[PDB]
Amino acid sequence: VMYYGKGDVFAYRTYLKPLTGVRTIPESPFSGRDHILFGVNVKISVGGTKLLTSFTKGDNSLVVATDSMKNFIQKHLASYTGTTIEGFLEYVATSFLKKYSHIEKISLIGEEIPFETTFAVKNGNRAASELVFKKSRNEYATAYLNMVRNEDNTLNITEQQSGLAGLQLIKVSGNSFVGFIRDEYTTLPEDSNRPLFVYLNIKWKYKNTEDSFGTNPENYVAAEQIRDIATSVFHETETLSIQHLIYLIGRRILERFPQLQEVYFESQNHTWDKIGKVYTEPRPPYGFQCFTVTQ
Amino acid sequence: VMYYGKGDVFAYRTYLKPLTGVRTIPESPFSGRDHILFGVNVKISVGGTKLLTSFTKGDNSLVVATDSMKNFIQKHLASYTGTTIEGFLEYVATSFLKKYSHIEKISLIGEEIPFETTFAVKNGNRAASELVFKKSRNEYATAYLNMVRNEDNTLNITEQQSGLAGLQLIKVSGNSFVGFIRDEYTTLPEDSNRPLFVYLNIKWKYKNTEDSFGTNPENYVAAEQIRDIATSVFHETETLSIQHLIYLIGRRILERFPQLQEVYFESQNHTWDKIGKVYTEPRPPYGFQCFTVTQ
Amino acid sequence: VMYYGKGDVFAYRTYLKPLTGVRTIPESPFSGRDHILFGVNVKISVGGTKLLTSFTKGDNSLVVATDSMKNFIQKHLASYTGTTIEGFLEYVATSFLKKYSHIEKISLIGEEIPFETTFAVKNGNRAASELVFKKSRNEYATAYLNMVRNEDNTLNITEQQSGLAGLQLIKVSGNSFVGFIRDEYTTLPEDSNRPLFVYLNIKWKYKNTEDSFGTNPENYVAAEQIRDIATSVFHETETLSIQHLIYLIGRRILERFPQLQEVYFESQNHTWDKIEGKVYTEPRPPYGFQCFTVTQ
Amino acid sequence: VMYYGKGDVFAYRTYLKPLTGVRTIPESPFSGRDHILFGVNVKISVGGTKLLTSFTKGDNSLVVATDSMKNFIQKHLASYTGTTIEGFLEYVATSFLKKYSHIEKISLIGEEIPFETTFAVKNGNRAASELVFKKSRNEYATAYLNMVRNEDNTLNITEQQSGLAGLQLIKVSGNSFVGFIRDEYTTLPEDSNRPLFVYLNIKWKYKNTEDSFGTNPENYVAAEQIRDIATSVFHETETLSIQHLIYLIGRRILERFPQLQEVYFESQNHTWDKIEGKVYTEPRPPYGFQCFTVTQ
Numbered sequence A, B: 001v002m003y004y005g006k007g008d009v010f011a012y013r014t015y016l017k018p019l020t021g022v023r024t025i026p027e028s029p030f031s032g033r034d035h036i037l038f039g040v041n042v043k044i045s046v047g048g049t050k051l052l053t054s055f056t057k058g059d060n061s062l063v064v065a066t067d068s069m070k071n072f073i074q075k076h077l078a079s080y081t082g083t084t085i086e087g088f089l090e091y092v093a094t095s096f097l098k099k100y101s102h103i104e105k106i107s108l109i110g111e112e113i114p115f116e117t118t119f120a121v122k123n124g125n126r127a128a129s130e131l132v133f134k135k136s137r138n139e140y141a142t143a144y145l146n147m148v149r150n151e152d153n154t155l156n157i158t159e160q161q162s163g164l165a166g167l168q169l170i171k172v173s174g175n176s177f178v179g180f181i182r183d184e185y186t187t188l189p190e191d192s193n194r195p196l197f198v199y200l201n202i203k204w205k206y207k208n209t210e211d212s213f214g215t216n217p218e219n220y221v222a223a224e225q226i227r228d229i230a231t232s233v234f235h236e237t238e239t240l241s242i243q244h245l246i247y248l249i250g251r252r253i254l255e256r257f258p259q260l261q262e263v264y265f266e267s268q269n270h271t272w273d274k275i276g277k278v279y280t281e282p283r284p285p286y287g288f289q290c291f292t293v294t295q
Numbered sequence C, D: 001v002m003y004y005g006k007g008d009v010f011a012y013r014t015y016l017k018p019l020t021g022v023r024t025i026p027e028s029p030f031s032g033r034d035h036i037l038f039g040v041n042v043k044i045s046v047g048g049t050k051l052l053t054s055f056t057k058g059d060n061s062l063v064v065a066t067d068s069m070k071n072f073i074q075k076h077l078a079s080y081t082g083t084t085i086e087g088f089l090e091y092v093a094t095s096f097l098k099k100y101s102h103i104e105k106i107s108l109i110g111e112e113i114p115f116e117t118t119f120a121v122k123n124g125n126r127a128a129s130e131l132v133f134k135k136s137r138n139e140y141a142t143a144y145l146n147m148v149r150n151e152d153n154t155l156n157i158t159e160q161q162s163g164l165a166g167l168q169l170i171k172v173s174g175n176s177f178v179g180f181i182r183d184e185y186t187t188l189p190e191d192s193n194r195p196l197f198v199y200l201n202i203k204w205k206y207k208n209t210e211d212s213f214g215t216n217p218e219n220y221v222a223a224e225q226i227r228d229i230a231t232s233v234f235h236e237t238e239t240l241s242i243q244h245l246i247y248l249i250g251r252r253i254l255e256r257f258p259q260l261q262e263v264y265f266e267s268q269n270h271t272w273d274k275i276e277g278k279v280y281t282e283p284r285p286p287y288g289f290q291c292f293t294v295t296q
Ligand SMILES: O=c1[nH]c(=O)c2nn[nH]c2[nH]1
Pocket: A177, A188, A240, A241, A242, A243, A269, A287, D004, D063, D064, D065, D066, D067, D068
């Protein structure tokens, strides 16, 4: 392994070009983003054989300072004319490889810093403020991109992946976990009606990477919509396990978004212990599942 | 100082009696709580001269186990027939002092564990789910109560305080900070248009402690409403400082809720550094303000 | 209430004057501090009735910017010629009130950012490095000070307290918790041999605030020595509860340090649940706690 | 992908067999582990094509409950008779695949929960306590193992890696960063004497996985020794960058431990900003990082 970079590059841009014309779906009201406030936390990693001597000899001749990568990212957010994190990452990746010809590969993560609307009384009635927003520490969209320079000097995206992270859902009834292996190590009672509490990270890949950029918004898959699919399917389903639930969420996502190639899940179980029904937090050990549905 | 207790007593109650009939205000749509899911994190502290020898002699004869206080709280959430955290704390405080006659004083904190509604498609249309909720790591209501046993053996609430914690608001324009002292220690530039980013903890006290309990919902002050007042006033105000803003929020709260005696603010400044306008996270040091408005 | 200030003012100073000349105790080998690296996190709060219109009218004429307070703290750490956080707080407080005559009161917290020594081989032997240090996220020393300006423009310290925070101690055996109330709310079993795990925050107050500054270091009480007393007493004691333990720790402290007026304890219970060798695991979140003062 | 498992399986064992008989190096006084208290946080992942219908049809017939995996881990810590996290992981992995024949692969992480010794006075002298320990939130040792079941029901380790995580080192002087690219994106000034502060995660892989278990302890590589090498090399070196430093640390490691095949580094830059004595303060959040492997 040989690479280096800069993490936690927070950047806040006001009045980015709004995202409009997004194809809606029955599970979600989402149609676009106003982009009055556009926050993203970026991580950049770059590699290339010519970086070797910066490690082996302490030769900094070919080192773009990691501090300079932060400048690069933040300046490019100022000049980005697109409408999505995915497109911003492509802009950064392309501009960076174009600028630094000794770099063979660049990997980017972009994590949304989400802000929610708030109420203000405008003259006489409540409405959404166009100035005051609430910082949310809940779920947030993500994006990932890897781009390489080929031997013929062309630039190629080798990997792209969008996601929703930090979604925490509890369904008070309509969940079971029964029929699992009962042997010498099994002390968990069967439960025909548990308040299943799951953390979800959902990530998707497009059949055609262009669709991720939002240029044709009709083909863009929004994390807001993925969220509302997850909650909708959770509501509709008499779950039989987390495994069972996330497969059904995945199938619905692929059905709603045929331009997607796959959906990947990282789930955790945080179901409370039962002790009017009252519950309490469990001990720290948490179950998890990881699973890919493909189109 | 001599007291002891139990903290992080999480308790989750389903289908608590709903809170209804709350007097509304122009800044907020709030009218009640469905209480399908009622989460609270409780801290209990108890004191009394008769506890001395548990410290000085290792005599546990008069020690209610802190583990038993957790049981006490969680069982009482199961039997609570009221509608607010404030009333739940009074129920716990009264029942505890009634049960343990060697305890002279009890202090309680109750912190809401908030859950937000989610979308589910019911047959054909999107609607709020009655089963699936989203755990929120954003702002949350709080409550505080101190109750003592008097020499004549009556029980008296000596202190009560409700609050909203963890509110994080950023207003992209319409804020200034100018005219402050410029001397040998001053390097901050004046700013006539900054994206003021403030954290708020807002706490209020009632003229009549009965109003906090929600028995007559007409007199109850909801944290949801305090929130929407704060965002509304933030929107309306060309702020001149955080100090200036929180005074104006306080005045509005007292005007809307004449049954309140005071409002107390704990604010922090997290305004981003400026570097299309792009900003970034500042260094760690944060300003703060603390201030009480009284009716 | 009315005050404002600045928090999380981290400041790292190199080559502060060493602390030496301290008085030893049986429980502790502590003999001083090198101060190659002296890290402190500072929080400052100021008050004064002349600040009212900064709230009520948005008038910043008498506002020291909280950004300026950060500059003030860090610049005074560069010029500080003493040897303790406690003395540093007094330096900042007195300088600040002298500088800003409309401020009537100032409160300061300083929390050590501790660093530990590391090994290095040089000139044929291994020894502690004078250059490379390890940042510790374990326990740390604390200091608190409040100072007011009187009507006649004199300044007075009105409260001072030192401390040790974040001490996390587990004793594997030699602890019991029995004989507590067993009623309808009791499911905890009696346990004659538990592996008591306590978090400890220990704070002390001096009879004479001057002893806190280090200027006559033989009268200073070091957080390192307080830690060592805590661990020794825990080892020595067949504990009957955390309450029992902390009273005993506080008595030894006031016995070892007759210049102290009182010691205050904030303890939390984080004892593991028991599940061949003995194995334990982390408990559910709810934690017991105790708060208790021992006085001379 | 398809797998499921259990994380944050904390487990604390008393009086595990001591680790002794290890081979020393100049950089480190490490000579073994007492194991009065042996804490580990374990994460387990399992896979197998026979798990598909648990996802696609909600059929739990072949689901080992993740709750049961936690029980499995903790019970095997009680019966484990070895001396390392690495050997413990192999014990759990082999037992689990033997128990559950439909599982084809298992991956395990174990992270040390470290505890430090404390002082206590007894029988007329002060010495380290055999009962009271201090929980450390600083660096800790790690271990990773993956094991698969072959078609013929044999089991094989397919990957093994040990490590040290959370090492936080600041060197106050004797570090430079100069000569990097200065273009339109460069605002960082050249600095010939900076107080380099690095976070280090160091992982190593053995030529022979058996050497990782402790069974012949003279061939074991201890995280404690790796730490000491890291700090020594940092002290010794006039660093020209973090990149420069970590390559040098990795070469010394592979020189000291010829039984290692490779060492891998994850470093982060957390160097303070400079603001009488020298004073520094915490930087803005963005942090540089490096990832690099040195091989024999
Ligand atoms: O949904 C679940 N899947 C599992 O594998 C499991 N194991 N314990 N509880 C569980 N719940």
